[PDB]
Enzyme design. Sequence first.
Site, PDB file in Angstrom:
ATOM      1  N   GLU A 155       0.736  -0.839  -0.393  1.00 17.36           N
ATOM      2  CA  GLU A 155       0.137  -0.073  -0.045  1.00 17.36           C
ATOM      3  C   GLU A 155       0.560   1.411  -0.423  1.00 17.36           C
ATOM      4  O   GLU A 155       1.554   0.967   0.662  1.00 17.36           O
ATOM      5  CB  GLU A 155      -0.760  -0.265   1.280  1.00 17.36           C
ATOM      6  CG  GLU A 155      -2.195   1.041   1.453  1.00 17.36           C
ATOM      7  CD  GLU A 155      -2.887   1.143   2.635  1.00 17.36           C
ATOM      8  OE1 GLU A 155      -1.469   0.863   3.939  1.00 17.36           O
ATOM      9  OE2 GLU A 155      -3.691   1.479   2.649  1.00 17.36           O
ATOM     10  N   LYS A 188     -10.835  -0.568  -0.638  1.00 16.80           N
ATOM     11  CA  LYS A 188     -10.305  -0.462   1.516  1.00 16.80           C
ATOM     12  C   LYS A 188     -12.053  -0.277   1.599  1.00 16.80           C
ATOM     13  O   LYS A 188     -12.526   1.016   1.410  1.00 16.80           O
ATOM     14  CB  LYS A 188      -9.215   0.369   1.826  1.00 16.80           C
ATOM     15  CG  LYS A 188      -8.325   0.406   2.231  1.00 16.80           C
ATOM     16  CD  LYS A 188      -7.335   0.963   2.522  1.00 16.80           C
ATOM     17  CE  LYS A 188      -7.278   0.966   4.204  1.00 16.80           C
ATOM     18  NZ  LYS A 188      -5.649   1.530   4.581  1.00 16.80           N
ATOM     19  N   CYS A 197      -4.100  -3.559   4.478  1.00 17.23           N
ATOM     20  CA  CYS A 197      -3.716  -2.716   5.328  1.00 17.23           C
ATOM     21  C   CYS A 197      -4.456  -2.743   6.943  1.00 17.23           C
ATOM     22  O   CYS A 197      -4.553  -4.185   7.446  1.00 17.23           O
ATOM     23  CB  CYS A 197      -2.809  -1.167   5.444  1.00 17.23           C
ATOM     24  SG  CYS A 197      -2.327  -0.662   7.427  1.00 17.23           S
TER      25      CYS A 197
END
Lengths: 325, 325, 326, 325, 327, 326
Positions: free
Chosen positions: D59, D131, D164
Amino acid sequence: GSSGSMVKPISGFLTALIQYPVPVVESRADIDKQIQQIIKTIHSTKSGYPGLELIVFPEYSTQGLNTKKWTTEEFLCTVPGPETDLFAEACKESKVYGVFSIMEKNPDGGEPYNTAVIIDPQGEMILKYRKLNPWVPVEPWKAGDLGLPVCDGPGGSKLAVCICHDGMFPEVAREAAYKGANVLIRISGYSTQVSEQWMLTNRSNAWQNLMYTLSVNLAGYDGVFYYFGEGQVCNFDGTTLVQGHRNPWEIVTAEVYPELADQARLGWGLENNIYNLGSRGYVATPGGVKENPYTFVKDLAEGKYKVPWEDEIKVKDGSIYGYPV
Amino acid sequence: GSSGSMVKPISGFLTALIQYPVPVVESRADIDKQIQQIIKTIHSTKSGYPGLELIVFPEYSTQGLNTKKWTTEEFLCTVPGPETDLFAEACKESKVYGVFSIMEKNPDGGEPYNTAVIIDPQGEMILKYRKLNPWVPVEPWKAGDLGLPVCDGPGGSKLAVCICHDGMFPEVAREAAYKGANVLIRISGYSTQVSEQWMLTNRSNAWQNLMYTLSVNLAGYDGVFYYFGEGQVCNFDGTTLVQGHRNPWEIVTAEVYPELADQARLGWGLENNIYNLGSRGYVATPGGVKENPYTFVKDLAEGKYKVPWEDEIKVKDGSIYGYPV
Amino acid sequence: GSSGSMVKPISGFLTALIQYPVPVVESRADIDKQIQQIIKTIHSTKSGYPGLELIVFPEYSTQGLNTKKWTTEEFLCTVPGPETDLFAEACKESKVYGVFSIMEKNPDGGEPYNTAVIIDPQGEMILKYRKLNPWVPVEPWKAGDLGLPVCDGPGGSKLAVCICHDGMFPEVAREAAYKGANVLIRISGYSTQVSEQWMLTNRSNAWQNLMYTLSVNLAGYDGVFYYFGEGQVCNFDGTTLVQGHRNPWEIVTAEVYPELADQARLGWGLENNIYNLGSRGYVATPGGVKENPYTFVKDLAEGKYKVPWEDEIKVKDGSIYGYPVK
Amino acid sequence: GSSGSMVKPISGFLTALIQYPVPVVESRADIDKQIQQIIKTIHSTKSGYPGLELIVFPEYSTQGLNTKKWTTEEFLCTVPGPETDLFAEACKESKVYGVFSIMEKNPDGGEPYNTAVIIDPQGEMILKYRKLNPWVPVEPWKAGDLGLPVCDGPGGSKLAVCICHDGMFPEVAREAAYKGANVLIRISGYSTQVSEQWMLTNRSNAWQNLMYTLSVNLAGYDGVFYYFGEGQVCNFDGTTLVQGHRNPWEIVTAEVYPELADQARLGWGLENNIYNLGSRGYVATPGGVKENPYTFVKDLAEGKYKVPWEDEIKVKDGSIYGYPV
Amino acid sequence: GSSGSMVKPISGFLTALIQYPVPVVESRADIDKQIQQIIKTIHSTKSGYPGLELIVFPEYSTQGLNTKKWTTEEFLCTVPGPETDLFAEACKESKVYGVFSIMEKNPDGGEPYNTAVIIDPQGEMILKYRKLNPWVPVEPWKAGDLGLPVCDGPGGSKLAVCICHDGMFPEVAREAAYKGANVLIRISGYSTQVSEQWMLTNRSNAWQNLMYTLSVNLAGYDGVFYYFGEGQVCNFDGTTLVQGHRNPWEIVTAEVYPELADQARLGWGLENNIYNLGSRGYVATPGGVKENPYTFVKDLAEGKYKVPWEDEIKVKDGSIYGYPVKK
Amino acid sequence: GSSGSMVKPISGFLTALIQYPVPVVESRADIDKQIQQIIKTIHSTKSGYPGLELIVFPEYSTQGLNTKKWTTEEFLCTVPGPETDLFAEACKESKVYGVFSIMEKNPDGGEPYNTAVIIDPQGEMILKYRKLNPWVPVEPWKAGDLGLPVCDGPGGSKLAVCICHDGMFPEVAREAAYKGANVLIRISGYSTQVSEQWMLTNRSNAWQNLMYTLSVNLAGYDGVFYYFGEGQVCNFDGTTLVQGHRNPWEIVTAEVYPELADQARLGWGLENNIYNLGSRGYVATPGGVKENPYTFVKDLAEGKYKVPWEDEIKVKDGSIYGYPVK
Ligand code: NA
Ligand code: NA
Ligand code: NA
Ligand code: NA
Ligand code: NA
Ligand code: NA
Ligand code: NA
Ligand code: NA
Ligand code: NA
Ligand code: NA
Ligand code: NA
Ligand code: NA
Ligand code: NA
Ligand code: NA
Ligand code: NA
């Protein structure tokens, strides 16, 4: 040191630390049965490891932790006495140094002591130590009055013994080293409450003093606590060389080379801490600054160590465990 | 404590330990450059962690370890001085407590000190400490003469600072706790020689004193040594909560809860060692036995600590590193 | 939390997790024997740790795992019943919260449940839980029908219990937290097959939910499996604070501070995951996006969770362990 | 799986996870520079590992974390766009699957997305993911609206990607597995705050779902945070097979065997948890109990997940990081 | 491999390693008790793990380590004999491969052997191995004379067995691999002296040969030593997949996938060490350089391995443990 | 051994292992830069550690791993040559033993060698070793033809050196010990592929032979691989005494006591394996059984080692890395 073999090493000595099962002791007859078992273990361990020179039994291996009877006359012994004489004969027969635990009748009629002895391969008691730091509030033992002695051991060792809770005080390990010990033996009867801190302090006690540590606890369940065993040998730089688990009867052995610790104490520059403690900043001040910078050291020396929050400490007697105040 | 978030916790405070790259410093201009970089780091770290209250820089972060110039007038500062005033303004602007390292000109013209300061969020210097235990024989610093002070910090903390080698002496951590500290900060410029013993002592210093430890070293290579970083936060029971690796610029953060350490000090029975040290065997002897059993404590208190092998110690001056005797 | 002492801490409570020896149980008399032994352990552990407020026994500590008799009437109990009454009296006498395991006769005459209870220091049963996720295909227990309850515990705790296999489902720990629990208790009777995954999930269950976990398994050999013990206390950030080994009778104790977990739940920004789960991207969308993005959540909610390879799964009944297929 | 060699294994595929240095990005020219670096890394890594089939970048590897500019038009891209076209050409030339991170302009003019793509060895984009769980309150990204897709990958893999913070939610890993993924890829730009919890969740995400996890974070310092790297491959039983440290440019490689995870899913009895979740107690109830026992699942399915303490939560917007209302 | 379940995996097999309690054996009746207990354990372990195909018992699980009686006729058996026949019947009934330890009367009347056998699910003895490296000076066993055999096992495995001290010699693991083994089984009766080195060598024996290792020791106290258990399964790259502690009766199970080790042996370039050993520098020299560069290999091959300090070695017979020095 | 100080110990010697940054080398001028940097490091490390007697540099520290140029004449050196003369002068000036890596022109014009040398404090080359086991298929080096030599080192050591892949063969460590080495030095230029197996073999190489191991790899990124560093000192019982991480320029130091390893070799009964290997079952057979029981040892001794699956091995030349086949 090293994890070793079963021989007397050319430099140093071989040790066996016994994770002795915690005894459940209801009478003097049970104490006699522990004495017989300890003696049997001396002979059997020597047969298995012919080069063995130092065998170590844990705190309370002789008498257990029967907290309802442990200060009765029936449960106490003199040191020396018939019991240490039996241990001594066994050390003589197997030609080993042995470390034993005896709860000791106070010769002046006061509160009993928690005592450790070292007996040599000729059956002579060469060290007697009374636990300086009883595990309060659970333990009733009188604070030891013999200081922290040292004796000559096998393979050029200078041995000191301390007991259980003692090893949580860095002052105990420092004292052993200051008196000349290059091997600190810690015999112990702790519950699982301090399993991590046991390993941690065995390492720090070694590193801080350029000293080997040999440490062993009882193992198993006595109906109240589980005792963790965790026999442990640490190198003089703090590195763990051998580590037992939590099983009753695990034997932890290692070769120890005392001369290497002495040599580091004579030879090290950076991190010669046992010397540096009392001779500070010797490059700026030839010979080092000698004056004490620690208020706790002054206060403790004068018998007036008093933490600034002492008045608010809740546990200051044995009442939480049912001891009269 | 906890590995935390980026907020001021409800019971305690958030800290950032900076594994500051080891400076290579050739002149006073380079010192100014380090000052600027430290200041930049205060502001940037606060921006990243808005709840931050304590930022910690390592020993020698201001001036490096140029062993050929480090005691020249050009490389030394007054404490307080213009350099600490710049750090103070940055602590005021970012509203943080900061811990800084300054090699300090001796006000009498003698050998210089290795100094640490804490500055508060109003830009006031609230703690000044001179390294008690220089890293001899490599370090030329005068042994510190201000004892080990304590101050009030964020989140109900009572802070003490020690420097590098100091943290290898359990006496330093014990003194901090005895003076009331519930958080010991260790700022450091060690080479890789002691990487393991750094982690070990940060844990033992915490456990032995029911005290949090916050510890950080420089990281990277300066052309001579590699400095290991290894920022470390230990719980008051000795458990490591957060651990950095060996990279320059790693930031180690954690939530610390000082009141939990105070509460363990007031509340614990078994293993209340900071209290037990000076009041032994209180079940057998009401109030505890107060007399000192440690010869080293007496000797050190009397300014006469002397190990029994002292005459045979080989390294007693700085000649091995080219310091004149 | 901390590895603790033997006192009631100023901010929280002291717990003892008992790595109880796996019972070998051949008759009701053996069940009575285990009951007596458990009770003896309550008193003895309180005497050793005077500040103790929560004592935890493992799954099957009362009745064992005699797989040839465990669903016979002789081996089952009512909950509450005389057996939980004896546990309750012991909790009252020692003034502790206790967690116990009982294989429970089904009150409607169907298949029995695997049940856990919490009893308070006044001897009142304050929580009853039926194992949601039986350890199939070895276990015959009916899937639990009481959800995952929570109760008030010592030191400001909100307690939930789950049983063994339950703790392998992150949905169980999430549910406990969502119902308000700041301490999840996992009582267990696993074999060594999952020793590593036990420790791993006790940590992840804690971290993901900003919740303490207190977990303990039976220990020792019953003639078929070795049960690994491994009592474990994890901090609300997932850090292991205390860890037992595999010995019968190891006691794992710790101080737990529930208010620290509550405070993190109220205070944390980054990694406030228990909140973030259902309110996503709140900087871009004030209040957070609420719509569910997970197909498994929809399907499970609707009672139609079905993995895309389900038709090819080989083990779908108890026949591999000799249970008749009904 | 295995730590592997540099060949395409007979049952699976070889992956390289790149602990890409965190970029410091001040303009579009800097983004172009990162694109060139990423492309160089594809070719160089393939030359070093000829059997490579899957290369994974973290990321923010394309655009950095310039929190003052990251939602400006200059710093955002379309997906697909010229940038993904360049990545695609590089995947085609080296004949690898690649995983890339792009901060994506919102096609309706609203808040931008944080996006990941997988491109195949023919240069086709086969997966696009936004995301789901932005790292609030620091991240401004819109919550993803494409669900959690899966695609076919090398060596019989079914790949999913998450980003993440996503990997802290067991619901994300569960969803990937439920959609058919036997390999979950986690690309990440975390600071050191969650180092331990990163490794922990990569293991639990694998075990809970009988799924391989391949996970990698940026490494190094960007002037604000240190990014930990820690590339990690976990076996479908949760066992870590390979683990990177915290250095910029560490490459973590492994052989992965997707069919072993599929086989465990088809074969396992005890601990077939991905199946057990929705079919409970199948020995007592033929076919298993299907009804949902979890209130949170119902509430979340209904768009009404609400923790019982929600009114008292202190951080509910980006104001602590200076984001307006 | 994997920590596994209780099923036969689609690509491999399930194994159970038994940390069998060290027997205290005073007579033949005690040996018969151990035989019954081992057999009971085969059936019970199969009942608990229905997919089980390989069960492994430690060295001395049948006869103990009674060092005062272990070479008496009463304490020795023939291999095969009535005892292995009982093990075989139990393997047949439970449909498992089993690995057993028998101290073996020497058929020529010389010193006895320390022997391991593998029996298949049809009750046939498919491997017999005599301990090559007795644990001297404590052990009286004759050095083994059958080499290091291999056999076909479950799930496409090629099995070899070695015994205790054997696994400290990397030459043993290398030989097993060279003979075709993709799974090395180590059965053991060590004391705590080598607990760390046990785990270390189980990993290196695996990595060096692209071979799985399955290893288990007795556990508990026999009145002299504590035996550490520590059942261990290592992947073919040396990674530990499952690790037991030191408790008597711990069962260590795992799924093993032999074909993955075979595939690495066929497929690996860098670190294909089992191949590289005897064909060096094949990029510079097509086919590789074949000549021996190791003096120890020549000397050992010729039966003249002799360390340069041999004359100063102190322990060269069993006298330190009270064995008479013969010849 | 011990983690040590900065002094010459009374029983042994102090070593520094340099996790030298991987060089990126494009020309001879770059090689000259590495030579200067290595020399600078000898002097600086001695200044920091005045008791230092053995400094160890990794494989490829002189010339890098430019796989497109590494066998060109520009990138190769003679051993000895001007480059080793410069290293020797530096060892003489700092009074240390040094270990260096040189890719060596083949004196007959054939394929080059990968070479290690030890130079003593008088500047004399006392050991020259050509890598026995090139890291095929990536490495083009000719298989070494000088065996595995040993020399006298500081503090009563008998030193052997091996190079990178060599240390994955237990035969290499065994041979070193058999020739008398009590300290094996492993200099290395591995990528991250074998990080775990590096540490594992450094330990097993030590334990199996009652021998210290001192091992160090390059660290950092060269544009293709990351090199892991991980300098490691293992005790003669296999215990790791000191362990570096993966950073460029980490220095790993330790005190080593060779006489302790010699003493274990003379003294040990149980686990005296270096002796036991060739004298088996000496209690039953006085003097031990000497006959070789290992087929691989016979075959290798005969130059006919051949694994039974050799015909099916896929990688037998350098074509996968673009080396022409013939
Ligand atoms: Na004897
Ligand atoms: Na041992
Ligand atoms: Na006071
Ligand atoms: Na000092
Ligand atoms: Na002073
Ligand atoms: Na506070
Ligand atoms: Na102290
Ligand atoms: Na590998
Ligand atoms: Na998870
Ligand atoms: Na050191
Ligand atoms: Na060239
Ligand atoms: Na030459
Ligand atoms: Na070092
Ligand atoms: Na030959
Ligand atoms: Na030949």
